[PDB]
Amino acid sequence: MREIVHIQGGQCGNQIGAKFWEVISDEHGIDPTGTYHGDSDLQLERINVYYNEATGGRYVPRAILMDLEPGTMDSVRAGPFGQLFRPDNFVFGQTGAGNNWAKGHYTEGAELIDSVLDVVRKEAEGCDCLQGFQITHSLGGGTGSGMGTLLISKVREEYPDRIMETFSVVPSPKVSDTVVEPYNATLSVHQLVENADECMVIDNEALYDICFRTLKLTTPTYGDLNHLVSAAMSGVTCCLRFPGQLNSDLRKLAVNLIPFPRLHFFMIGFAPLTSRGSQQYRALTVPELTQQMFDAKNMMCAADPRHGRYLTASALFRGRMSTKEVDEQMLNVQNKNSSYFVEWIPNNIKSSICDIPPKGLKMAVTFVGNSTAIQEMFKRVAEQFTAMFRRKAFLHWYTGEGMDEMEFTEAESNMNDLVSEYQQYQDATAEEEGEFEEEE
Amino acid sequence: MREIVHIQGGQCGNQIGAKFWEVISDEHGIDPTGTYHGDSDLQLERINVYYNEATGGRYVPRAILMDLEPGTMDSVRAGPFGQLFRPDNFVFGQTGAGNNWAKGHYTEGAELIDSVLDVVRKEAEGCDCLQGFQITHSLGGGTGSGMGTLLISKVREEYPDRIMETFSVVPSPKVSDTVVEPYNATLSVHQLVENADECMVIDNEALYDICFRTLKLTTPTYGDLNHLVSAAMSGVTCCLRFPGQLNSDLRKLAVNLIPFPRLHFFMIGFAPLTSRGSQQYRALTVPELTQQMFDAKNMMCAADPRHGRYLTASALFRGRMSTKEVDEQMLNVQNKNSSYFVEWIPNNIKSSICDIPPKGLKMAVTFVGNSTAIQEMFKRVAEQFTAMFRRKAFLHWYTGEGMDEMEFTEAESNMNDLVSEYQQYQDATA
Amino acid sequence: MREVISIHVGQGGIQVGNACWELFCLEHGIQPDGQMPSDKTIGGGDDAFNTFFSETGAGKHVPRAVFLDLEPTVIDEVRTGTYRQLFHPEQLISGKEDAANNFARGHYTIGKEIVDLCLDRIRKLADNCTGLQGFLVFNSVGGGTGSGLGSLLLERLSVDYGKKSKLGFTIYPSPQVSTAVVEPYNSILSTHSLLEHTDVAVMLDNEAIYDICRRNLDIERPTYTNLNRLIAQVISSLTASLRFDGALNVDITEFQTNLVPYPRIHFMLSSYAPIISAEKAYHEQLSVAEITNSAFEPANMMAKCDPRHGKYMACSMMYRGDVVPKDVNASIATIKTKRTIQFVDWCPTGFKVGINYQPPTVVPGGDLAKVMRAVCMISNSTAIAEVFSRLDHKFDLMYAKRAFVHWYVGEGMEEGEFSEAREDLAALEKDYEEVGIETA
Amino acid sequence: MREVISIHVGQGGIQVGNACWELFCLEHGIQPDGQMPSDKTIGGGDDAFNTFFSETGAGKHVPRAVFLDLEPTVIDEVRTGTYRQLFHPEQLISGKEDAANNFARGHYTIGKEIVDLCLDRIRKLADNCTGLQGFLVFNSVGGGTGSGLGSLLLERLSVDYGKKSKLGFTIYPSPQVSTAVVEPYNSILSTHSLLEHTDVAVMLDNEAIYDICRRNLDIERPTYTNLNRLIAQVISSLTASLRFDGALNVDITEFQTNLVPYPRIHFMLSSYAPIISAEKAYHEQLSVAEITNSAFEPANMMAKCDPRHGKYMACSMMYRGDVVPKDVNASIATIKTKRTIQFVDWCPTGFKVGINYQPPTVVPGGDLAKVMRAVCMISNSTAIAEVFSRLDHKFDLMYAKRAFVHWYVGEGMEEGEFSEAREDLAALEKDYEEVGIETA
Lengths: 440, 430, 440, 440
Ligand SMILES: Nc1nc2c(ncn2[C@@H]2O[C@H](COP(=O)(O)OP(=O)(O)OP(=O)(O)O)[C@@H](O)[C@H]2O)c(=O)[nH]1
Ligand SMILES: Nc1nc2c(ncn2[C@@H]2O[C@H](COP(=O)(O)OP(=O)(O)OP(=O)(O)O)[C@@H](O)[C@H]2O)c(=O)[nH]1
Ligand SMILES: Nc1nc2c(ncn2[C@@H]2O[C@H](COP(=O)(O)OP(=O)(O)O)[C@@H](O)[C@H]2O)c(=O)[nH]1
Ligand SMILES: Nc1nc2c(ncn2[C@@H]2O[C@H](COP(=O)(O)OP(=O)(O)O)[C@@H](O)[C@H]2O)c(=O)[nH]1
Ligand SMILES: [Mg+2]
Ligand SMILES: [Mg+2]
What we know:
This is part of a larger assembly, with two copies of chain A and two copies of chain C. By secondary structure, chain A is of the alpha/beta class. Helix content of chain A is about 40%, strand content about 15%. In chain A, the strands form two sheets. In chain A, strands 1, 4, 5, 6, 7, 8, 9, 10, 11, 12 and 13 form an eleven-stranded mixed beta sheet that branches. Chain A has a two-stranded antiparallel ribbon with strand order 2-3. In chain A, helix 2 links the parallel strand 4 (about 65) and strand 5 (about 90). Chain A is globular. Chain C is globular. In chain C, strands 5-4-1-6-7-8-10-13-11-12-9 form an eleven-stranded mixed beta sheet, with helices on both faces. Chain C folds into two domains: about 5-265, Tubulin/FtsZ, GTPase domain (Rossmann fold); about 270-385, CATH 3.30.1330.20. Chain C has helices spanning about 10-30, 70-80, 105-110, 110-130, 145-160, 185-195, 205-215, 225-245, 250-260, 280, 290-295, 325-335, 385-395, 405-410, 415-435, and strands at about 5-10, 55, 60-65, 65-70, 90-95, 130-140, 165-170, 200-205, 245-250, 265-270, 310-320, 350-355, 375-380. Chain C is built from 15 helices and 13 strands. Chain C is α/β, with parallel strands linked by helices. Chains in contact: A-B, A-D, B-C, C-D. The structure holds guanosine-5'-triphosphate (GTP) (2 copies), guanosine-5'-diphosphate (2 copies) and magnesium ion (MG) (2 copies). One magnesium ion (MG) binds near residues 10, 98, 143 and 145 of chain C. Chain B: Keywords: Cytoplasm, Cytoskeleton, GTP-binding, Magnesium, Metal-binding, Microtubule, Nucleotide-binding. Chain B: It is found in: Cytoplasm, Cytoskeleton. Chain B: Pfam families: Tubulin, Tubulin_C. Chain B: Its cofactor is Mg(2+).
């Protein structure tokens, strides 16, 4: 059991979800028509974690595809493995959010969520034991940010004990594919930091950086950006679906990743990713993969860990590796990066092993790292939001829907408090000398 | 035995019956010429419940098709399985009620009913042990409401002990396919509440909502609406016609659905109904069907059970299911819906198991629920009726047929008492 | 010669019956036609059946059992069954119209027509019988027929047959899981009648036995048919001593002395101990001293009363198979020593032990393991009080509102008959505590 | 007859268990089915197994062993394993949701549900057992289940069974190599419970044993499975005396007298000495006198405490094979004469020697040489303090910040419990020096 309900909310979310549910159907051997054509019996021992066995031995994703735009349905239906998702589970508005948190949270989205909950409740009650939820939504756009947060707020009021995991695409200043991103994202994090157990911040900038450097793609498309997110998304929740030499799960990661309740933003990354030309040369060994996973480059977040200092990390190694060798590497990493690891809370790195690798690979890794570097990416959104909010630019749309200036202030406040806290975890290391402080 | 005499009174009633007697024919395997072509001997073991074996091994429905319009006969003959029904049983006038309770009750209908009672008596006396009747009429139209109630009054005076079950289409404010609906319906319920043992309120609005949402039909017709009513109509009386792990019948449901005599309005709802596209994905398990049957969407009545609190409910599960698993689900539901179940009278839900499923299905459920929500649908009719009666609008027709204003006031008074009594047993805490 | 008449009243009575007569037919070797195949070239199991089956003189054996129902459907299922040619057509008595879960219909309106025909059938069966031991009766007290007519039968039988013992196996409604809403009303009105006219009443709550199936047989989805099979095995084990040879023989007449101390306290529980799925039979020693401990388990009780609240007033252990009396002696002795098991003061020696050499029969298609030992403990416990108080509480919620009375009153039961019954059951649960009180 | 109940709690527990029961099955000659092949035309190894396997009476031997996990994945692996048909289904108990490295979940929230079911199993096993010697327990104190539920068990076991010894093989986290970040918190809360309810607690730090594999077995990349096999051999060598015949017999009861001087000092170490790769077995004499010296080697200790800092308060040398008591005597005498090895004053004769003729079994696929001599030395050392000081220091960095407490507090543990625990462990490391202090 330990089942996971997936909600893919807002265009971005649905497209990530589309690729994700392809990735997981490969590892479990499910074919686009919902039949099992896997060779190993290990592929169907724990399937129930993601799929709810339908009649006639079809497998159906426990996905709730929500948007305020009816066009997206056509897109997720167009995709290969589009026939996997349950029609009933598709819930779509008509107008759309129009990149407006308010439209997706207070007015248009506020009418739809009631319908969505009734699906969420239905799929959650089916599970004998619910591990929790994996919400996949953009903070940048309205629907994903507006509804996404409103739903998250709703589900948490109904299912407090159940983990709330979120794979969210934060808006990057480099890309800036929308103007009002800073507003959406600022009002989002306020709702996320209160109602999300563990939020895995993803950034398009970084994902593009992984595609032009780590991999060498001539034309990285949002498909190829989604494929990296989906690879990681599997990694985070594998030791549920397969055996391990040392088992873990979502709650186990949370307990060891979140020291204090508010600092629950993490930088996901995937270690065995190599340029197709550069494969020959690269030797696939635990040390090699450990080097890449702790390279700032590998991280799917804009902020380089180097500026921050890891409060903790977690690795989820795949395939057949000697646990001793892993443990040797995790130790070795912590002695090297003396500065990039917090003084208090020693043996910062956690390690999980799962026996089953990802398809077409011998070994792999998935990395989840709570740093004070993640602060930096949130400062970018703050600086930008402030600059708009100094003048009350674009503010008449949000105010139009019925949101009040008070909200916009509290959102900034609440995000500033987060930013102060992550910086504070460098002041508790600043303990150093008890007689006098290092600044003089 | 435990035979059931069906009366399908008024256009709406005759069209429901047409579809009903097609649905029951598929289950029992009877072909449109009255010949048995079924493959399972279980199909004929208890056929006598609904059909009377005629000469030459033809099966005849025990249906009394009454209407004040002669055009309806053509309609029930036209239908496939229109040759099943007995030409002596068809009793039709000439003029028609004209959507007037009075014309269908006090004048035109008052002349016909004496002819119908002679057929009712005949078919009722043929049965060794009569379970009761299943009247199918509309409260909205003049014929179904006028004659239907007048017949129901008559049959009950002759046959008190025998169950009087009614599948009545109440007029919905959304549809409003007639103007004088409020008058007819208000005068109907007055007669029904005194003379009907168990009334299963149906609404077109709800049936359309099941057709656009639960099912996904591009063009739901009165054929499709009738098909849903019929599907449920089978379910309510199956454990008569087939074996069961736990048996029930009409009187058993009544004994456990009606706490106090006046509270015999119920919401019927059929569980295994699914959109054709969504079927692949849906898993056909006792829990899944139990979730749909208690969904306020699934009910064939306008009023959401969420507003009321179930005085009681009954499920009539079909196919081969573990009785334990059913019992687990019914318990699970009652804990969950702590508000939507009355405090006094615990273990509110009744359960019945019938081994034989409906055709082309592995499991099914039919739901019958006595809630205090049903008052909300009657308030709509009252609010409407009052507005007309404040001014005495359209009243001259009803007054013209020889009905007095006193009758219109007592009908409103008696319907308000019903609404008061449900609200009592909602608000009550014990 | 050890003759027992079996009266199956109501659906629950008949369907339990079917399962009983499957088991009996297999035990004695009677085929569905009713003709034992004359094998081993000697009448080796000759006179074994005379307990339950009457030899007609032509080689055909007929069950000494009256199946009674006010509904035709259940009895028709027996007539169109494998055992159609086994049961006497007149013994299988039918009614046209059911009691419809109304004691009043079963006790006055409908019941008074049929009971006249049943008593004639019992008399005919009692005339054939030479030294009848007792009347086993099977009725559901939740349902109309079993409550109403089943009570009326016992009243009439008690005047006609006098001394002949009446052991009633009653299916009292479990408090959590109830099949019908009007079950309390029936149960209470039935119990008052049952409280005077039965000698020993063995209580069996469905839910409790359902739980045993999920726990011991490891079936996720138990049916009534699976349940009815366990009920049969109990009845078999109780009457076994008559049918098969044993070291320490019991009789249906003995329980009545050893188990009932005071007349009104005749209510009992039951626990057949080695209920084991063949899957886990592999891994179980199944010694006598285990089987005994497994009997006194609070879970393995077939009625849902936790005897740890009560005090055992008398226990009747009925062993079957490779059972040595020395081994039994130690097992009881260790139980007497235990703390969890607590005995009343006024009962110094509360055990009646009954050892048979015949092991229990494994029914084909039957959820049980072939096992070389067994035991059916019928126990008189002060805990029984708990079930009655719950049915009293569940009843008193009604009749405050006069909730469903209009039915019962319409069908000839005066309203004061409800008040009477509750007052008498209130007088029972007074008695059960009074005997539970330590001696002054 | 020398019966030992094994309780395997938590992943680390179960997986160690699997390796233990492989060894035992090979040692007695039980096949995976659980039927010994009846060979040598005599029951030559008859009653050897009655330590670890109950005969079912049908020719099937079942392990006397409860495998307990709040997580389903590890226990499933056993159920879909070679030894699926060996272990009694019920004995393999599973939870739906893991403790997730949170003592609190295991000790209150989740544990309290399952423990009830576990004790019932232990009672059923202890009923079969005639003259039970003791409860062997296997729990990780780094992990939730093994810390939490494993501590809750012992408490409950201590009241119920009373005298019956409780030898606890505990996988304390090595300081250099740690798998989880929240380990110190678990370990300390576990140790406090453990400190009062276990009779003898044998400490085993993974890292130490990992180093032994790299040093003695010459494996560059050791796994847990390689580690678990060495743990098994120890357990085998300890219990050996019961199972096989020996010159100088020991018993699980004996250690408790000869190794624990004072009640609170029941922490130990262990060192199985002839750990040799077949590659270097060619070139080694492997005389008793060598094996003994190899046992007292600081490195060959399986917990990473360098006993040269401490004083040996009591040793328990357990030899197996071609061992002559005269040869042992000299070996100990030379150790008593050595300077590096130092004994407390108040212990004048510290050694308890145990000689078994049975040599240790070579597991196929196993990283070990078939050898004709062996020794398992459980040693009470003042050095143990060192491990507790490092788990106190690593915890004192935490709980200054109130680091991870929110989790623990949320799941029922009052904050003050953490403070109590650290205060009792500080009291332990006070005692350990106090006994180390030369006599006044
Ligand atoms: N063991 C068992 N109990 C049953 C079965 N069917 C019904 N029961 C019990 O009987 C109750 C329902 O009453 P019925 O036995 O149907 O009623 P009846 O005595 O046949 O009388 P009517 O309901 O009037 O036909 C349930 O609450 C159960 O406790 C069955 O197949 N097996
Ligand atoms: N010898 C050995 N030790 C192990 C193994 N797996 C884990 N451990 C030890 O146990 C610790 C992790 O604890 P787990 O056993 O996973 O945790 P648990 O007690 O089962 O509780 P949960 O994690 O909540 O399921 C590690 O730090 C190791 O010291 C294994 O296979 N062998
Ligand atoms: N990684 C990724 N990001 C996307 C994709 N599509 C849109 N986005 C990002 O999402 C942001 C806007 O969110 P979107 O969901 O499109 O708008 P919404 O529908 O109003 O929430 C933009 O800044 C895009 O960079 C995609 O397929 N993959
Ligand atoms: N469900 C359903 N309702 C109908 C059908 N035909 C008519 N009605 C309803 O019945 C009401 C009028 O009753 P009708 O039977 O036409 O008039 P009558 O013949 O005078 O009773 C209208 O409000 C319609 O909504 C039908 O085929 N199906
Ligand atoms: Mg019945
Ligand atoms: Mg675990």
